[PDB]
Symmetry: C3
Subunit: 169 residues, 3 copies
Amino acid sequence: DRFYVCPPPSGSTVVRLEPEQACPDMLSRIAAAWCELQNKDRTLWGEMSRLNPSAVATAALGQRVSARMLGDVMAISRCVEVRGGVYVQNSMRVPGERGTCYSRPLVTFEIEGQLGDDNELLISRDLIEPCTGNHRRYFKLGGGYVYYEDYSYVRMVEVPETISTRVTL
Amino acid sequence: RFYVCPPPSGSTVVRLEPEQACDMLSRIAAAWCELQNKDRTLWGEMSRLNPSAVATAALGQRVSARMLGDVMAISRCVEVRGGVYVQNSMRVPGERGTCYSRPLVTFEHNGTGVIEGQLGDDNELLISRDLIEPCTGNHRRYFKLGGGYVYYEDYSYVRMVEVPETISTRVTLNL
Amino acid sequence: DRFYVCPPPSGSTVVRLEPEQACPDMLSRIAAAWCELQNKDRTLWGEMSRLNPSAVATAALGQRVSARMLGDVMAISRCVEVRGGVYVQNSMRVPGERGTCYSRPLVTFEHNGTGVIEGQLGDDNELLISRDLIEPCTGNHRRYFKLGGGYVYYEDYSYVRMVEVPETISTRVTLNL
């Protein structure tokens, strides 16, 4: 899948989450339940907007967007594809400090940033954690995954095993 | 509307209904069942951070709630009757650096008298004024207030606004 | 329901949450929206999998598993039934320091792999071998923990009685056909 950078949301585009919607023979009990379902779910969507507004808004608009909460309202900025080659960097240790490492891999792309959630590329290399033993991480990188051990790069891996929360109809 | 939330007591205690035992309208019915079983886990996880919002959704009436271990304490929320005064400055008078996360309000009714509290989520008026955060530059906020929203640049009131711009995760089913 | 121990997931089995799928007159309008609904829904599961991957995994599989993140992927390990009896401690007060307390009850139970484990009641009837879920103490302290098919009641950090909570609240949407 594609790489995006996410431009900071300005206080310009301000939107909110579509409120609960009023609700209206076996094609009719289904329609009302479907409505009541959608309404109730909005409470879950509400809670997520608080913490992960970006991901609530991408799902809502069907496009890659960045978001921040400015209180009780959302500030939307469109994301941009990175056509280039992206390159991951061997170490994940911070060259100026010991006992601190980047929590996610460093990359360079066409600038010196680091890998975010779901193939987002950041410019800010500032996701850091205290270092650990048995440090093992798999990071989604484009179509595949890249594996790290003791914060030193190891290999690109496939992860075929899959778990699902879909309901089959 | 507006609401005050009394603190729930250990009087009536409830819990989330557990997962349930489960031609085309039959498979659909089955999927519908399973979907409810699966969503159940989403509701459970939220009920720990925000039991209130879980309860009110499940109840149909604005309620408040707290977790007592794995069980939930409830109280109905009182509907606010009367005018409201929104303060203009969200800076705490007591200290520099620290301010209010949401706008202060004064309103009044029921037992017993005028309350100096603050604006909560989803048009809940709080009594406790403790929603505190250190000051930041270029600090824009909006806060839901009744139907519309109240704008706030660098920690003080500007104007009343609106938001025609609606974003939906809702899914449509036109039968 | 039944009790469960949960071995720590080594990265031996590592999984990912299955991606969204491309979506295909009145019956069609449904399966379409049903598919768009699962698609949308996946963002919620993506989120939860970040705080409680164990619960995301057990819902997915239909069995009690315990998970932990290793980056953007889930280490899975299948949980095992505990079958012997169980001793519940009366006092959720921690022995070492005043003011510090367990936030879930202490249990002792016996396993088949290892022997007697001095553990602790956890969510949805899981038994943990650790005894380190620790909050500070409080007055006015009332808790109800899920234990077997009932709930056990504690006041001021010490056992009281075996309650039942008949009272139920629900987010379910009924559909009758």
